[PDB]
Design a protein around this ligand. Structure first.
Ligand code: OOY
Ligand code: OOY
Ligand code: OOY
Ligand code: OOY
Ligand code: OOY
Ligand code: OOY
Ligand code: ZN
Ligand code: ZN
Ligand code: ZN
Ligand code: ZN
Ligand code: ZN
Ligand code: ZN
Lengths: 268, 268, 274, 271, 271, 274
């Protein structure tokens, strides 16, 4: 079997970690004994099943120190199962909110986070693979402050106001061309990584929380940047400015963002 | 047969009136002897055939003095045929360009045009039917300066620069919410009718012709209106301002636009 | 041929009268059968929905009454599916009671309020006689025409338009109009519909207020299941209120028959006023 | 479908029927492949297509569940008729029939708490998984050797324990919001666990036994709680009353309830 | 498919074969339902599924065409084998075989212009419809009573008039852009009409008859025009040279060409 | 089993090497068979495309040569379809000739230019011997690895990436690389490919310029069909140019055999320089 198939029998559900409109996710033990995360899709129309096959067909091939690991799939009945490594501390947005002045985190730790996500994004960009909804909700955090990108899931249900109706679009993380022209690239993803870099250094506020979805857009579009955070070096806020270039071409490569971050994270 | 079926044999092609990527349109004579327009779709995948059935199923029911008349359809082989009344003077955008200082038209005639399109739009709005691409290219002109709305056709091919890639969207005719939020209503159609009213009173210039598709958007969005035309009364340019309200709710009803226009067109 | 089929081409839409997740409804012209009608058009149209739609035409093509909205035919020849009905110019009785109440002419007479209730009761006697059970009787679901002719305007898309009248479970149930056995047990009978009629009679005499409008759906239930009966409206004579009570007995067996309800409302209708 | 665990029919020997219903029979049987051992076999002879899909659905789910206090499921066979589901055999049967047997020798407070704790444990697992049981009662629990108690999820209880429903919903096990608004949550289950607790400490009485199905509903909704059993310490009645808050939100977690019950079980109070 | 016009096989009587090919035979036949009249019947016995769809395609198209100077098409039958297409019978056959017959009694200048005009008229209709013929020659035109000439669109010319192709493209009827860039437009047709004109005024010579298929191509592309026929007035040679501009865009419309030819036909020049 | 199948799970993508309407191409890791490869992935994948893709695997699974890019297997187990090949680190010979020409190290030696031409000719002898006809020989369609190993890197998505090298008809044909009979008649043979090779030899000796780069596609045709032969490059000794002429004879029969072309290029390769 070309894609990796895990047998249902080799899985034991332990508890629920998260819920959506299509999916649930559980902690479970896998035999052949280790813990894992299981995306159970119970809303299983053939359109949705095929989508789920296509998704597994892709993830089977991806592999990076900062892409949440995919162990495999079982379309042997219902619900449809996708199996990943368990990330013990969850999604980064809830993690930042935990571990912030509501002690906080060492500026080296905030830099290691940023760094570790940038790595993951360096992998996707060399693949010319566009993510289209990067955010701290869509990254995961494991033992030993390991961070990785936990692709999508059902974040649109969970973190509801972050998106907006039309489709549900993460407008607070999107550059203007993605908004206006609807173009999604590598360059729009960098932009979103600038917004991520903000999230990390605000210990996980919603971008423009003060503002609502329809006025949020008039801000992003009218070219107003986001404020430098208290916890934020101007060096770092330079990196953000370098992500936010109005013009996609004049924005930095995620490769260079990744180098500056990894340089700072060692030697702040 | 519930939809009106015309027999191929009862049609004789005379010449080609227009061309696209999906369709052609011909002048032909219909027996049971009169002239007509025939949309011949030769690109006939089942997805496209079904779409074409759905379209005929709808038009069979619509009927208005300012909606180009639909005589019927034949899916009896290939190419798929839709039959309409022949409009002798074509699309209004080419018509305005003909009959303008490149004599021109009596301000009563420019008002009769505007008026006659507004009627057509009054019919669609009471049906809560949203057109989504109104323009002078998408209206037609017959003997005795009769104007009607000639729904779509293949205008995206013919009048190419009027749209923009993503889908092809008539950005120069769209309000900001249609642009930004992607919402299309009755209220966005009125807005587009304001732009139409402009086209008529510029004898058919492209909105923001000076400007290109990506800067055109920064204009519409930043709330800059279009200049009052030379040939244009301020009364009329009041009607346009009343279509262009940033806020869809504060825009006029097409019913009221239609009354003011019909009032002026009698008594300028 | 068995069910009557209208041709699409014999239809000209004029405009929209009403809107729903499942259906829209237009005023149209109908050629042959020129005369006006209302067309229910369903652009939903799976096959489960396409079947239900044929099933309903198969039923409605056999019903006929002075006070059941008249059904002319159906066309399943493509999309959207079409069901053609008589046009009732003044629409749904709820919006009509609200239009024409203390909120000239002025508010309906008592005699007109009675004439309205008699005509609904009339429609409902026909259904009970077929041992047919409506399950959602309400003024929103009766229609009103020229010179105050009133008829039962069946389903449509009531759960979308008058959304706060229903409560969730994923069934949406007209809790405010339902007796205890229909809430608790989900037993819907002719006797549950008589209950609902009582609630309609209240709507009528309050120019179309939501029953227990001051209560949420959950405390609305509490009040109903506990026994609490709605207040006599300011407009409601005590003969009429007795009717409502008649319909609101807790034991289904003990409730009045729509046939009796209907003769008393007709009697009162004809009787001179105070 | 090597994925769910398949048992071969040939590796079963039916010994005798334990129980009977409208959709199932259950038999004690011997399973080859531990060369031999006893199991209980759910056999469905109804067996439409609609009913065979639900049976392969239920088994696909049960395959993944595992807990000291959820009836162990060994596997399934849909190679022909009847459809088989194989579970561990629990020697003493349903906890209701066990409680009537072992009550006025009667069971020690320590034992009744073990029983309550063991059920509660099973309910912690289901709540963990945000999985609603909807029909938790002593009759839907089974009892093994060494007073092991587990939850016995599917079967034909509505046929056997007929009067405990009304037409069919276990109204005596149900809170006002389940009865009135048809709402089932981990909160409505806790309510039912409250009643289960009552059942244990009454050695298996039907709640409101003295009232009919209609007037039962009336007391539930009107606010009226069940009476403190003779056998029930006031600490344990606190636990019952915690589960019986009218406001779902104000009702204890199963996780606390289980933690108290497990503590008391190992270190009971005087009474 | 009441839509295209169907002829019943029973209402046909085959009289004799006129012609023969790899995909067709054509017969003269009598059509009942004008109780009786002659027609030509294209009969295809090849008749794959691929080839039956193209035949119902071609007929669906021909049904809609109508012109004084396009071979009239009466209808079709795909009720079995062979597949039938029915056309008006044109008594004198292809205009090439007619031109060789009627040349050195020879035809009047007035008549040759009528011929050129009548073909041109047919080509105006196709250009009107933005419809490219791709293989316009005297052999693909037919001639009726009273020197009526029309275009005889489909058939088996490549089989009969074999040498006029190369392996198969009518390179002697084709402009440099058709040969070199495989481009067919109403412009490349006009080019071919130019050659057709040559053919008329040479009483049916093959263009470059004296050259082989390879070296023909070489003269076409190198720029070299065909010679003014003896029978061809300089006004008419102007028309030929107009159609032979190397630049498609600089080549006359068929509509002008037709207008001149029709004028000259009614009012010829001296020669 | 017949054709070799690689498992998807035995693939880790590392990054993208190239892109097209039909295909992308990644550098990957391949486990078992750890070693590097190039994976052709087609996300197009109708069935006409899915079949062509199986047909090509069925052919490529039988070819094997020192100078035909090595084919490891294919997986049709889902989307996207996968074809696994040896990784050639320095990519397509055209981009490589342009990299490493007058536009240190410095521009390739004559000996290296000859070593490159010999290796292509070598690959092309194998195809002619199978009487297989490439139809699009060009430096864009040969691949270059570690220490100047060169191989024929078949199709891919050449018509998208090197789009101006082709001309329309809706077929896209490498007009600049085609002899008269292939332009005019569309006759593609071993003899047409030898022609193309001559054009490759010119590309090689011009560090990868487009033939007739100063002419449009239509006047490029004129010049070819008229007889006009490309200029001797500044880098090209007259022995080598004689080779090109050898390949550019107008009569296919009169042209040299790739086998001869290949022995002369190998001879020159070994010969000491001036
Ligand atoms: O390991 C995963 N996720 C996880 C692990 C642990 C936890 N809790 C541990 C205890 O304290 C609270 C957090 C929560 C999550 N989730 C649930 C899914 O929503 C993203 C947060 C995981 C692994 C692979 C895929 C996966 O699916 C996703 C990924 C991102 C966003 C949504 C779903 C989740
Ligand atoms: O009557 C129709 N259209 C027409 C009539 C006449 C003419 N010419 C007459 C001679 O001087 C030039 C103009 C041109 C058109 N067209 C072609 C299609 O593009 C819209 C202009 C007609 C009728 C029904 C449907 C229809 O399809 C449309 C409608 C709008 C836009 C595009 C196609 C066209
Ligand atoms: O004729 C019908 N109905 C009508 C007539 C008129 C009007 N407006 C008149 C102007 O002031 C506002 C109301 C509204 C309706 N509707 C809309 C759909 O909601 C039922 C009321 C009609 C006739 C037969 C069937 C039918 O479908 C229904 C009926 C009731 C409820 C839902 C659908 C509607
Ligand atoms: O082992 C099982 N159950 C059992 C064991 C033993 C006995 N007897 C022991 C000796 O004195 C007489 C009773 C009775 C049962 N039943 C039969 C079905 O009614 C549930 C009690 C068993 C194991 C797994 C699943 C299963 O299916 C159920 C579970 C609950 C309710 C109904 C069926 C039964
Ligand atoms: O009536 C038709 N054609 C005809 C009439 C008569 C004659 N003879 C008349 C007496 O001296 C001998 C020749 C020959 C033809 N053919 C046969 C097929 O080769 C095209 C000339 C005719 C009518 C309609 C369609 C049709 O099919 C074609 C048309 C052009 C070329 C080939 C077939 C033929
Ligand atoms: O290994 C292969 N190819 C490669 C290796 C490396 C590189 N880059 C290295 C860094 O500097 C830029 C070039 C590029 C390619 N490509 C991309 C696809 O276009 C063929 C060149 C390869 C191996 C086998 C088959 C294959 O598919 C082809 C080959 C040629 C043309 C099209 C597809 C590619
Ligand atoms: Zn499986
Ligand atoms: Zn037809
Ligand atoms: Zn119909
Ligand atoms: Zn089996
Ligand atoms: Zn026939
Ligand atoms: Zn595979």
């Amino acid at each position: 079997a070309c894609v990796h198939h895990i047998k249902r029998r080799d899985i034991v559900l332990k508890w629920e970690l998260g819920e959506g409109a299509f999916g649930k996710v559980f902690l479970a033990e896998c035999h052949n004994k280790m813990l894992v995360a299981v995306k159970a899709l119970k809303e299983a129309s053939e359109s949705a099943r095929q989508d789920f096959q296509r998704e597994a067909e892709l993830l089977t091939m991806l592999q990076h120190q900062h892409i949440v690991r995919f162990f495999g799939v079982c379309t042997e009945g219902r619900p449809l199962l996708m199996v990943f490594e368990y990330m013990r501390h969850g999604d980064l947005n809830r993690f930042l909110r935990s571990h912030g002045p509501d002690g906080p985190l060492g500026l080296g730790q905030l830099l290691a986070v940023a760094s570790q996500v940038a790595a993951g994004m360096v992998y996707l960009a060399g693949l010319h693979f566009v993510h289209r909804d990067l955010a701290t909700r869509n990254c995961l955090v494991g033992q030993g402050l390991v961070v990785k990108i936990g692709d999508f899931g059902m974040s649109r249900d969970i973190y509801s106001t972050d998106y907006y109706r039309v489709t549900m679009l993460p407008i607070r993380w999107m550059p203007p061309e993605s908004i206006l022209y609807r173009k999604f690239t590598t360059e729009s993803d960098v932009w979103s990584f600038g917004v991520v870099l903000w999230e990390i250094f605000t210990y996980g506020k919603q971008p423009w929380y003060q503002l609502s979805n329809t006025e949020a857009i008039d801000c992003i579009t009218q070219g107003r940047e986001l404020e430098r955070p208290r916890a934020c070096p101007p060096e770092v806020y330079a990196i953000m400015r370098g992500c936010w270039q109005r013009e996609p071409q004049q924005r930095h490569s995620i490769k260079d963002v990744h180098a500056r971050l990894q340089a700072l994270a060692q030697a702040p």
